[PDB]
From Swiss-Prot, chain A:
GO MF assignments: mRNA binding
GO CC aspect terms: cytoplasm; nucleus; protein-containing complex
Identification of the protein by name: mRNA 3'-end-processing protein RNA14
Gene: RNA14
Residues of the full protein shown: 22 to 582 of 661
Residue windows of the HAT repeats: 41-73, 78-112, 122-158, 169-202, 237-269, 278-310
Role summary: Component of the cleavage factor IA (CFIA) complex, which is involved in the endonucleolytic cleavage during polyadenylation-dependent pre-mRNA 3'-end formation.
Keywords attached to this entry: Cytoplasm, mRNA processing, Nucleus, Repeat
Species assigned in the record: Kluyveromyces lactis (strain ATCC 8585 / CBS 2359 / DSM 70799 / NBRC 1267 / NRRL Y-1140 / WM37)
Length: 555, 552
């Protein structure tokens, strides 16, 4: 739709803004548009662009990073009028990001705005506070956090106390630091212990700690193994963004998604033994780390969602997280339905139709986009057509029991309108509900008939159609359809499967003389067919062929 | 007690298809020379197994070993019965017995004319009836040969007919697939020369065409056969427990080799006329019904082959019947028969035949439940065969003789309790339903069923499926409730929650779903919250949320 016909000249800013509109989740495309506006120093558009990105991906910590970075690089112009409102938004209470790289940014700023020199008291006394919150909110939950612990450390050591009420607090802190770090699974405990030992001597216990340090040192071994191949390579600067280290729409390494679910599973055991708030934290941390690095996996959002709602009340929590998940994957049926389901519970009936509907809109456009970028890939297309229809079916059903039969009609009315773009399952699924009204076959039957308009050649359809006629016992009906399509049904392996069905049906419904004939026609169009193997199918009782499992178990 | 004749006549009554037991009872009456009992015993074997050609052999043999006493009063009526028209046996080992007799009762010396002239006729019928259909026939072709060669013509009207015959012989043999065509040609060449080598060439040319054709047709045969086994004993003393099939036994490998050889034959590579090919077939079919006699498939197929031919509504039935006599407990053959009796409209045997199959299975079950009741699998495997036939019997009688009939039957299945399987209440239920799509009656049935199967998840699962099918909301809640504890296993109970949950969804509420869903994950912690979320959203027995999005 856009791109095609919306043909601009040859001004990057226009095709990009067009391609982005077609793939609003391709993070890289925005990165290119930014790179461009920054090179033309059109700073106003840089923020419009960063904001559309923040709007859609609130918890993509690294995108906030790329942004704070951009400012910091203006040297002496670390403008607190631009900088603070950003941090303020991305470090908030709800869509509050908790990632180390971003905190290391938060710190750098706090350190450039409170000079240890001319500030004195609250100066070096605020930087400490800033280093502490990063320690409580995230440093103690991240095993690959060493780099930070060092940062905080060096700032405490390289500090000369002016008197003695300081000389003291400096060790009071240098202690509370070391102790804190040494009790968590980390990539540098071994060395960091060797350091604290020596430290304590040349200053004036270690037995107590020694315990949790051991426990830690090895809990980091299990970690290191569960992780093993964990990839965490998102760019945190604009220039480091490469097509290769940002996910393309709907992309994501399964291997990775599995390593993450695994780490999360481990965490949920609570091997550390933390209180209920400290463990709820430690998981929430890991969960947001995963939603950042495999953001396009609908299962990580699905799971994080339920983990946060599994907690306490507030009917809004579960919906909050699916919503964010749907924003990263606008085309996910997993997420659409999960939302659709929550809206129904907190009873907001209007959004139920809204959300599902969008997912369809997104899929519609994805289908269209492929039918044109390479219409020769008839599988990838049917795969989509299938997904389109599947969603329609779930929609129709869901509308039918939420807003009367007349609703379902509306929907199916328009699926028809789509023709061959949809798949047979919509008429079958419509049929089966158009029936269940008042067990009547008058209306319900007229449906599939229509369908025959586009699918009288899909043995796949016909089969499922007979299965219905047979199901809702309508004898004549079967004979009719069977007849009409023995030539018109492509394939063979599927037509065969269709004969056996109607023959088995004939048998159950009297005659045996009728059977005797269909049986003749069958073997003519299918010479070579094993007379006795097909004999057994005619006598399956309860979908099971016992003749074969008991006597001819060699068949 | 401890008198062989009694335990044997007992065991035999328990396994009337165990051919070895009759052979023992016979070895016994023979060593006591109670000849009148030997015949009664042989005849019971003949009654049940008409075409076990090799049993007629053991019996003719027995007589021939009474030396001078080749009593044509005993012998002839035997041959006459086992070489007749309908149950006429066509096996080469039996014909070699028939010739042996015909040679002892028509001496070449004192008979002269019709003497060696009747012996030839006998050799000739063995040639037209079977010798030319059997490729491992070499042994016979030799016999006939030596009898023609070792014959010096008294004059010249003989000198001639002798080579007229030795010709007609060699010609006939070299034209069919055989285990010694190579050597038999080498022989026929030299023969034509030392008889008129002025035309050894101009003749041998013609034959040389089909001789080749055969020499290679025998090569395919030899390949398809390769591992064929044909070792039945043809004398009473060669019968060992190991070379006679135990009741219902039969190498599958063998049955396949036979069906294969029969397919080959049906292609008609030989190019024979329509009666000559129909014979060649019938020969091989009878060979197969002798060596894998307890395989219902061979009898089944032989049967339809002989019917597929022309008219005579009784042909297919004749053969199914002999096969059922070999395997009284065959559901395949009982229904095949039951079906035939129905076409030739003799409704009364429809019930008879199915019923005996049942009797035999009942007896089979009983006997296993006793000889080794620890083998609970082999037991249920049977209780399932018992019930399966009952169901088919019940359905069959339902449309053949009214609903009241199905009742009678199911009424006696109940009488059986746990000896039968759950499928009978399910099957009865689905019919008791289809009367007038009413659920009052059809439902009271499965309830009964609950008496013995309230613990079989397998049953409860299938029960629900029905409740759901014939949409009866509450009913599903009730059953679901009542058995979440009483249902053994887990893998089955889990499958049961899912089902009832997917049902709850389809039938409004979603707040009800919300709850069941809760109880589910409690009794089943560890269950993948998202995997079970997809199942609830299947559309047409298919979980697309999984095949399309979460396809890993």
């Amino acid at each position: 739709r856009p791109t095609s016909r919306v043909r601009d000249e040859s001004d990057v800013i226009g095709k990009l803004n067009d391609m982005i509109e077609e793939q609003p989740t391709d993070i890289f495309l925005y990165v290119k548009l930014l790179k461009h506006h920054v090179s033309l120093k059109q700073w106003k558009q840089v923020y419009e662009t960063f904001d559309k990105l923040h709007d859609r991906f609130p918890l993509m910590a690294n995108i906030w990073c790329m942004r704070l970075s951009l400012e910091f690089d203006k040297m002496e112009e670390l403008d607190a009028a631009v900088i603070e409102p950003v941090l303020a938004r991305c470090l908030s209470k709800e869509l509050g990001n908790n990632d180390l790289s971003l905190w290391l940014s938060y710190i750098t700023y706090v350190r450039k705005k409170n000079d240890i020199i001319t500030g004195g008291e609250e100066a070096r006394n605020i930087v400490i506070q800033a280093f502490q919150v990063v320690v409580d909110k995230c440093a103690i939950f991240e095993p690959k956090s060493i780099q930070f612990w060092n940062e905080y450390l060096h700032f405490l050591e390289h500090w000369k106390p002016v008197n003695k009420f300081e000389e003291q607090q400096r060790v009071q802190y240098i202690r509370k630091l070391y102790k804190t770090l040494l009790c968590q699974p980390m990539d540098c405990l071994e060395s960091m212990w060797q350091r604290y030992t020596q430290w304590e001597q040349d200053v004036n216990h270690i037995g107590e700690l020694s315990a949790q340090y051991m426990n830690a040192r090895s809990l980091y071994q299990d970690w290191l193994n569960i992780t093993k191949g964990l990839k965490r390579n998102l760019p945190i600067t604009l220039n480091q963004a490469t097509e290769s280290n940002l996910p393309k729409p709907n992309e994501y390494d399964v291997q990775q998604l599995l390593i993450w679910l695994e780490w999360i599973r481990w965490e949920s055991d609570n091997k550390l033994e933390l209180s209920d708030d400290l463990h709820k934290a430690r998981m929430t941390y890991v969960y947001m780390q995963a939603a950042q690095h495999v953001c396009f996996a609908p299962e990580i959002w699905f799971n994080m969602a339920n983990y946060q709602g599994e907690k306490n009340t507030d009917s809004t929590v579960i919906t909050k997280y699916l919503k964010l998940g749907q924003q990263c994957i606008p085309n996910s049926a997993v997420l659409a339905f999960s939302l659709s389901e929550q809206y129904e519970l907190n009873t907001k009936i209007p959004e139920i139709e809204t959300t599902i509907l969008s997912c369809i809109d997104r899929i519609h456009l994805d289908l269209a986009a492929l039918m044109e970028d390479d219409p020769t890939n008839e599988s990838a297309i049917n795969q989509l057509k299938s997904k389109l229809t599947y969603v329609y079916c779930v929609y129709m059903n869901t509308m039918k029991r939420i807003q009367g039969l007349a609703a379902s009609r509306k929907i199916f009315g328009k699926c028809r309108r789509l023709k061959k773009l949809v798949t047979p399952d919509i008429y079958l699924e419509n049929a089966y509900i158009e029936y269940h009204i008042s067990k009547d076959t008058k209306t319900a039957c007229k449906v599939l008939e229509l369908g025959l308009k586009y699918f009288a050649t899909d043995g796949e359809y016909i089969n499922k159609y007979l299965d219905f006629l047979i199901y809702v016992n309508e004898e004549s009906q079967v004979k009719s359809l069977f007849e009409s399509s023995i030539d018109k049904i492509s394939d063979s392996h599927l037509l065969k499967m269709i004969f056996q069905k109607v023959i088995f049906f004939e048998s159950k419904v009297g005659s045996l003389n009728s059977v005797r004939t269909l049986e003749k026609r069958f073997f003519e169009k299918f010479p070579e067919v094993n007379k006795l193997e097909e004999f057994t199918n005619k006598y399956k009782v309860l979908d099971v062929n016992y003749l074969q499992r008991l006597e001819l178990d060699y068949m």
